[PDB]
Amino acid sequence: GSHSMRYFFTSVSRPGRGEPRFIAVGYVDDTQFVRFDSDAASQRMEPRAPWIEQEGPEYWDGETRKVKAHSQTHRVDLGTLRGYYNQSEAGSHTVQRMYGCDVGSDWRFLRGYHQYAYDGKDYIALKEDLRSWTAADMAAQTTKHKWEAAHVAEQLRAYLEGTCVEWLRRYLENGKETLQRTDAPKTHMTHHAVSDHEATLRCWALSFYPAEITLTWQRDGEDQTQDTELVETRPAGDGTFQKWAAVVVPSGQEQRYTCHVQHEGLPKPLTLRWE
Amino acid sequence: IQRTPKIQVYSRHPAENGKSNFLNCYVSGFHPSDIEVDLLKNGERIEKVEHSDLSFSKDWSFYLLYYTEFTPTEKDEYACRVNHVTLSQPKIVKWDRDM
Amino acid sequence: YLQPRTFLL
């Protein structure tokens, strides 16, 4: 199916005037492959997947130089934003950035992303057309004007539509065995009787990749939302993901309820029922 | 802007007593990123615990996975203790084998 | 493959 490359950056100024934290992680789909951590001070872009560790020293030197450039960039941003909003240095603030590209089943470009957040809220974002910006507040409009005069969108578009896509295909090819896999979820249902009157049916999905999945309950073949609980998809720690959906039902009506599982790895959607 | 972390304590594989496994504590949806996570064994902090690299979701909220290799028994009790600026006191979630 | 250029807020 479709694939994506994503970079996520977190820059956190710390209380007082110490040195801010900078974190960069790279993903292909739901598989992380690089990282850079100032609290884990090695000063090198580090591999986190076997298919990227085969890249030569020129690649790692290049990414290391670039990730340091990214780090120093956000180091200025924290100070710039401190001025935009009139904030002292004594406080702790967070700058976040994400960018990347999507490709379809044919590995051709689909969409590009390049967006920022400050203290957990939108700051500025490049729209879908990759030519205009969305400024969340007055401060961000200063960035929008500056970046419009410098034609930043035109430069980022070339990277997102070109460079980003070209290197995603290389990553997908080098990590073909593991990046292009689809692990269908291993599903089962459990039954827990709270009392003589109610019972909880939990529908499990385990060891699936990628993370995208849909778990839904139905009663008599009709969607059921009341008396249900759904947890966030969670990582297993071995590259796969987990998720479950529960519903509280009256004793004797368990057979009315069905669990429906949709996943790209499944040949067909799954329907589970308590036997 | 502050968001409280969602906590999930669970094992990598289905928990069989005597089998080596991994105890996981997944914190998500929180902000700011600074957070304190400990894995407990019978109420005492486990010394050597690893964690994933900090990242965030589409809505800018952060998430982290803390984990350690462990061999469960029927006598041992594991939990995850989380403290965050949004929490007046540390939140302890006991590991439920069926959740 | 990171962006080769940088832009300041």
From TrEMBL, chain A:
<dbReference type="GO" id="GO:0046872">
    <property type="term" value="F:metal ion binding"/>
</dbReference>
<keyword id="KW-0472">Membrane</keyword>
<dbReference type="GO" id="GO:0000139">
    <property type="term" value="C:Golgi membrane"/>
</dbReference>
<keyword id="KW-0325">Glycoprotein</keyword>
<feature type="domain" description="Ig-like">
    <location>
        <begin position="185"/>
        <end position="271"/>
    </location>
</feature>
<dbReference type="GO" id="GO:0042612">
    <property type="term" value="C:MHC class I protein complex"/>
</dbReference>
<dbReference type="GO" id="GO:0030670">
    <property type="term" value="C:phagocytic vesicle membrane"/>
</dbReference>
<comment type="similarity">
    <text>Belongs to the MHC class I family.</text>
</comment>
<keyword id="KW-0862">Zinc</keyword>
<keyword id="KW-0479">Metal-binding</keyword>
<feature type="binding site">
    <location>
        <position position="154"/>
    </location>
    <ligand>
        <name>Zn(2+)</name>
    </ligand>
</feature>
<dbReference type="GO" id="GO:0031901">
    <property type="term" value="C:early endosome membrane"/>
</dbReference>
<dbReference type="GO" id="GO:0098553">
    <property type="term" value="C:lumenal side of endoplasmic reticulum membrane"/>
</dbReference>
<dbReference type="GO" id="GO:0009986">
    <property type="term" value="C:cell surface"/>
</dbReference>
<dbReference type="GO" id="GO:0055038">
    <property type="term" value="C:recycling endosome membrane"/>
</dbReference>
<dbReference type="GO" id="GO:0002474">
    <property type="term" value="P:antigen processing and presentation of peptide antigen via MHC class I"/>
</dbReference>
<keyword id="KW-0597">Phosphoprotein</keyword>
<keyword id="KW-0391">Immunity</keyword>
<feature type="binding site">
    <location>
        <position position="151"/>
    </location>
    <ligand>
        <name>Zn(2+)</name>
    </ligand>
</feature>
<feature type="disulfide bond">
    <location>
        <begin position="203"/>
        <end position="259"/>
    </location>
</feature>
<keyword id="KW-1133">Transmembrane helix</keyword>
<dbReference type="GO" id="GO:0006955">
    <property type="term" value="P:immune response"/>
</dbReference>
<feature type="disulfide bond">
    <location>
        <begin position="101"/>
        <end position="164"/>
    </location>
</feature>
<keyword id="KW-0732">Signal</keyword>
<dbReference type="GO" id="GO:0012507">
    <property type="term" value="C:ER to Golgi transport vesicle membrane"/>
</dbReference>
<keyword id="KW-0490">MHC I</keyword>
<keyword id="KW-1015">Disulfide bond</keyword>
<protein>
    <submittedName>
        <fullName>MHC class I antigen</fullName>
    </submittedName>
</protein>
<keyword id="KW-0812">Transmembrane</keyword>
